[PDB]
Enzyme design. Structure first.
Site, PDB file in Angstrom:
ATOM      1  CB  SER A  49      -8.779   9.572  -8.420  1.00  0.00           C
ATOM      2  OG  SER A  49      -7.742  10.220  -9.269  1.00  0.00           O
ATOM      3  CE  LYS A 213      -7.414   5.889  -6.426  1.00  0.00           C
ATOM      4  NZ  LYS A 213      -6.870   7.289  -6.131  1.00  0.00           N
TER       5      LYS A 213
HETATM    6  C1  NXL Z   1      -7.517  11.399  -9.352  1.00  0.00           C
HETATM    7  O1  NXL Z   1      -8.642  12.258  -8.947  1.00  0.00           O
HETATM    8  N1  NXL Z   1      -6.750  12.015  -9.772  1.00  0.00           N
HETATM    9  C2  NXL Z   1      -5.387  11.317 -10.235  1.00  0.00           C
HETATM   10  C3  NXL Z   1      -4.011  11.851  -9.824  1.00  0.00           C
HETATM   11  N2  NXL Z   1      -3.915  11.574  -8.253  1.00  0.00           N
HETATM   12  O2  NXL Z   1      -4.600  12.223  -7.604  1.00  0.00           O
HETATM   13  S1  NXL Z   1      -5.485  11.530  -6.097  1.00  0.00           S
HETATM   14  O3  NXL Z   1      -4.434  10.943  -5.681  1.00  0.00           O
HETATM   15  O4  NXL Z   1      -5.887  12.425  -5.520  1.00  0.00           O
HETATM   16  O5  NXL Z   1      -6.398  10.659  -6.944  1.00  0.00           O
HETATM   17  C4  NXL Z   1      -3.965  13.404 -10.176  1.00  0.00           C
HETATM   18  C5  NXL Z   1      -5.315  13.861  -9.740  1.00  0.00           C
HETATM   19  C6  NXL Z   1      -6.735  13.234 -10.303  1.00  0.00           C
HETATM   20  C7  NXL Z   1      -6.614  13.834 -11.742  1.00  0.00           C
HETATM   21  N3  NXL Z   1      -6.930  14.901 -12.046  1.00  0.00           N
HETATM   22  O6  NXL Z   1      -7.136  12.816 -12.408  1.00  0.00           O
END
Ligand code: NXL
EC number: 3.5.2.6
Length: 269
Positions: A49, A213
């Site tokens: 992400s 982020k």
């Molecule tokens: C991003 O890595 N993702 C999106 C979502 N939120 O997690 S974050 O807040 O760590 O970004 C779920 C986990 C992850 C994904 N698997 O897409």
């Protein structure tokens, strides 16, 4: 308990990596001098992400030459919804502004919002083209959600390095890649992030205003990338942290990232 204690006792990045039996990539960048300290700063890690920071930047950059792009409304369809869609799930069957999709994808990491923005900007190739034009020859966006979160050793798709992402955060969030109002909007989204309370922020003292982020996958990855503004004034710092640590739990991975913050705060002094 022993792993938690070893993490807490780690006072440098190499010891912290050993404490979790992981692979840890960190860049701590002083924007006044360009000096970096870290660990595995030039090894590739999956962005997961964390790429969303640069998808939003690509949108903002395009809006500088496409008047009113940020006000354009994009339909949210039932077929667009993914498991992680905390904001967009409320708008299925209606639409949302591009600007609100950007906010959602940064501060809640909404995966559906990211895919809709990919459609607006021209997909992973457009994000990669933006990265290259900004001066980043290393980071690359290749796939949509959720496939982009995969990682395979030697497979460079959707990867960055701690140092490449740190330099990119400097150029894009603090520098002149975007117009001032655009970079300020992006900075504000990062400052408002809601997903990182247990990660770098948990290890950084109150002297920093933090924008960040996060990212993760279900196998072993947990990441957090941050801009640190001193509340008392002075040059910002950039702190990127990419972890793969399959032998510890998701919550322990957050503890490792918090410890990165504690070590970094001490190294800034
Ligand atoms: C991003 O890595 N993702 C999106 C979502 N939120 O997690 S974050 O807040 O760590 O970004 C779920 C986990 C992850 C994904 N698997 O897409």
């Amino acid at each position: 308990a022993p792993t938690d204690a070893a993490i807490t006792a780690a006072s440098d990045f190499a010891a912290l990596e050993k404490a979790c039996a992981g692979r840890l990539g960190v860049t701590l960048l002083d924007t006044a001098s360009g000096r970096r300290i870290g660990h595995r700063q030039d090894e590739r890690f999956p962005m997961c992400s964390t790429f969303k920071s640069m998808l939003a930047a690509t949108v903002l950059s395009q809006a500088e030459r496409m008047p009113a792009l940020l006000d354009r409304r994009v339909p949210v369809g039932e077929a667009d919804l993914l498991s992680h869609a905390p904001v967009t799930r409320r708008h299925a069957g209606k639409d949302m502004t591009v600007r609100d999709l950007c906010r959602a994808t940064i501060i809640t990491s909404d995966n559906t919002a990211a895919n809709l923005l990919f459609g607006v900007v021209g997909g992973p190739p457009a994000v990669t083209a933006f990265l290259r034009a900004s001066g980043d020859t290393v980071s690359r966006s290749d796939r949509l959600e959720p496939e982009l979160n995969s990682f395979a050793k030697g497979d460079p798709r959707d990867t960055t390095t701690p140092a490449a992402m740190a330099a990119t955060l400097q150029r894009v969030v603090l520098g002149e890649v975007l117009q001032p109002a655009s970079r300020q909007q992006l900075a504000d989204w990062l400052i408002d992030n809601e997903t990182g309370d247990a990660c770098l922020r948990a290890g950084l003292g109150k002297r920093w205003r933090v924008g960040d982020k996060t990212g993760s996958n279900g196998e072993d990855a947990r990441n957090d990338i941050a801009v640190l503004w001193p509340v008392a004034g002075g040059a910002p710092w950039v702190l990127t942290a990419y972890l793969q640590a399959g032998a510890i739990s998701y919550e322990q991975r957050a503890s490792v990232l918090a410890q990165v913050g504690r070590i970094a705060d001490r190294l800034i002094g």
